[PDB]
Amino acid sequence: SAAPSVFLIDDDRDLRKAMQQTLELAGFTVSSFASATEALAGLSADFAGIVISDIRMPGMDGLALFRKILALDPDLPMILVTGHGDIPMAVQAIQDGAYDFIAKPFAADRLVQSARRAEKKRRLVMENRSLRRAAEAASEGLKLAA
């Protein structure tokens, strides 16, 4: 089915671009944004992809965005791109539900591996949800029938 999906957020257009190309060259369909609120407006518990964001941003930072996403769906994985100094915070965020972090300057291969792992997680989640809905629907039809 559809190629793996990513909502990518970064105030820095040059880094946003380099990361977006890395992901697209890895087979992902990417929607990128300069701001978190804009990305957020397109997100819901039905989103089949993952979110990748710089942890620091003017306005809504990466952890503020993470908390909005956690509220939307704890199983929608979020990856934090972080400078060395903010790693401890990113590790704390992971303890709180964030999915993973990538250190800057970003290594293209690490970015791809982290995104692929997160996307497999989201895919399993959506498939699980789908199978459960199918089991319920079937069960409901039969229930009525008999």
Added chain:
Amino acid sequence: SAAPSVFLIDDDRDLRKAMQQTLELAGFTVSSFASATEALAGLSADFAGIVISDIRMPGMDGLALFRKILALDPDLPMILVTGHGDIPMAVQAIQDGAYDFIAKPFAADRLVQSARRAEKKRRLVMENRSLRRAAEAASEGLKLAA
């Protein structure tokens, strides 16, 4: 249901112990081994847990163990504990199907986060497999019935 499960492999009994206690204190049930072949003898596609192993070991190393596991079940996640010098290889192994790596000397929190992510992945996989089997079984019964 059952607590998250781990097969932990390390030739070094002191590191094996410190890692095992970290995991058990994090809620995992751990079976630890000094050698890869011994751990391997207890593994199959039905294993509900994850594998964590030092990448270097006398006899069968961590990548040799990884290749046996890949052959058993690509979705049984394997985490490599690695020294700084072997990180590039561990990254290559991840590109080839290994799940993740942890750098030595191990940080207790990073070990726990990596194990929890891998264990959630395995749990989703086993649940997916279970739901599919349930859908097939139901479908088969109905097929016969009608």
